[PDB]
Design an enzyme around this catalytic site. Structure first.
Site, short mmCIF file in Angstrom:
data_model
loop_
_atom_site.label_atom_id
_atom_site.label_comp_id
_atom_site.label_asym_id
_atom_site.label_seq_id
_atom_site.Cartn_x
_atom_site.Cartn_y
_atom_site.Cartn_z
N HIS A 101 1.23 -1.06 -0.29
CA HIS A 101 0.09 0.19 0.49
C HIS A 101 0.99 1.19 -0.21
O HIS A 101 2.24 1.55 0.27
CB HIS A 101 -1.19 -0.43 1.12
CG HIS A 101 -0.13 0.05 2.64
ND1 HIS A 101 0.02 -1.23 3.26
CD2 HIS A 101 0.66 0.94 2.78
CE1 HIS A 101 0.95 -1.01 4.48
NE2 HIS A 101 1.12 0.56 4.84
N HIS A 151 1.50 5.66 1.08
CA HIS A 151 1.05 7.31 2.02
C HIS A 151 1.56 8.04 1.22
O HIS A 151 1.93 7.74 0.19
CB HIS A 151 1.34 7.32 3.50
CG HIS A 151 1.60 5.78 4.12
ND1 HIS A 151 0.21 6.17 5.11
CD2 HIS A 151 2.36 4.61 4.51
CE1 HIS A 151 -0.19 4.62 5.33
NE2 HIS A 151 0.89 3.77 5.37
N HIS A 168 4.70 0.98 0.62
CA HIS A 168 5.08 -0.20 2.16
C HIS A 168 4.67 -1.43 1.38
O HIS A 168 3.46 -1.95 1.35
CB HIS A 168 4.20 0.41 3.56
CG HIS A 168 5.15 1.58 3.52
ND1 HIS A 168 3.91 2.08 5.27
CD2 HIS A 168 5.92 1.94 3.91
CE1 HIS A 168 4.66 2.78 5.89
NE2 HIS A 168 5.99 2.62 4.24
N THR A 216 -0.07 2.31 11.05
CA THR A 216 -1.27 2.75 11.26
C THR A 216 -1.30 1.79 13.07
O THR A 216 -0.96 1.07 13.38
CB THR A 216 -1.99 2.35 10.48
OG1 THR A 216 -1.55 1.28 9.84
CG2 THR A 216 -2.43 2.81 9.07
#
Ligand SMILES: [Zn+2]
EC number: 4.2.1.1
Length: 257
Positions: A91, A93, A116, A196
């Site tokens: 994913h 960011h 990531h 997260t």
């Protein structure tokens, strides 16, 4: 629920997740001058030859491309790692502007985005058991800067329309993650956490020194996603990154001099 807004952003997470104030939190700022070259660090071994992507999903916080991790198809070994780590998902960011978006920073420098690639230690049996161990996950972090388009990223960019809102997912087979790797595998490594919630301190971070370039049009597409679900007021998915946390009692090691 947690998020990246003024009322549920990173500064509020500690209330539901006390470990947010832990001693091994990520991301961190990588000071290139105090990082220590460790010649005992082996080269990274990335074997994504048999990778099997399955689906792309907007989870309300980012979008994840998931992989089949029922067997050792796409694994990471070597480097500072012990054992085999299977790729489960990747994913990103990113920011609302090109001057921010990455979670890790290098000498305080922020990048436009950060990728990531999450892997779990096979000795623990499954992902859920692995996140409960200090050496359970190995995350490969790759910085993205705006410049020339990245050919291998386009397939991801084109499918984003289909998963605009939270909860939507789409079939995403035959995607090859090798197309997202920079040329060099030189890296920095330190023990850290998920960025997260639940923010578990189960990660060995492997951050690549060399960024990959993507075009502004490619990053623009990321910014069109929504945090909200279909039928709710639209909130653009931008700035889904956590600020750098204190290094505390940790040493960042470098695989290069
Ligand atoms: Zn992440």
């Amino acid at each position: 629920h947690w998020g990246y807004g003024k009322h549920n952003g990173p500064e509020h997470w500690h209330k539901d997740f006390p470990i947010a104030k832990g001693e091994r939190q990520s991301p961190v700022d990588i000071d290139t001058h105090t990082a220590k070259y460790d010649p005992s660090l082996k080269p990274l071994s990335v074997s994504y030859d048999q990778a099997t992507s399955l689906r792309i999903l907007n989870n309300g916080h980012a979008f994840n491309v998931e992989f089949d991790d029922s067997q050792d198809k796409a694994v990471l070994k070597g480097g500072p790692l012990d054992g085999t780590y299977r790729l489960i998902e990747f994913h990103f960011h990113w920011g609302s502007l090109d001057g921010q978006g990455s979670e890790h920073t290098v000498d305080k420098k922020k990048y436009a985005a950060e990728l990531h690639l999450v892997h779990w230690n096979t000795k623990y049996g499954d992902f859920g058991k692995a996140v409960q161990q200090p050496d359970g996950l190995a995350v490969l972090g790759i910085f993205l800067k705006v410049g020339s388009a990245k050919p291998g990223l386009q397939k991801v960019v084109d499918v984003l329309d289909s998963i605009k809102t939270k909860g939507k997912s789409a079939d995403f087979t035959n995607f090859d993650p090798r197309g997202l790797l920079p040329e060099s595998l030189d890296y920095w490594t330190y023990p850290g956490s998920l960025t997260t919630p639940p923010l578990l301190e189960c990660v060995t971070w492997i951050v690549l020194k060399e960024p990959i370039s993507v075009s502004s049009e490619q990053v623009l597409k990321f910014r069109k996603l929504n945090f909200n679900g279909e039928g709710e007021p639209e909130e653009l998915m931008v700035d889904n990154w956590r600020p750098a946390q204190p290094l505390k009692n940790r040493q960042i090691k470098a695989s290069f001099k």
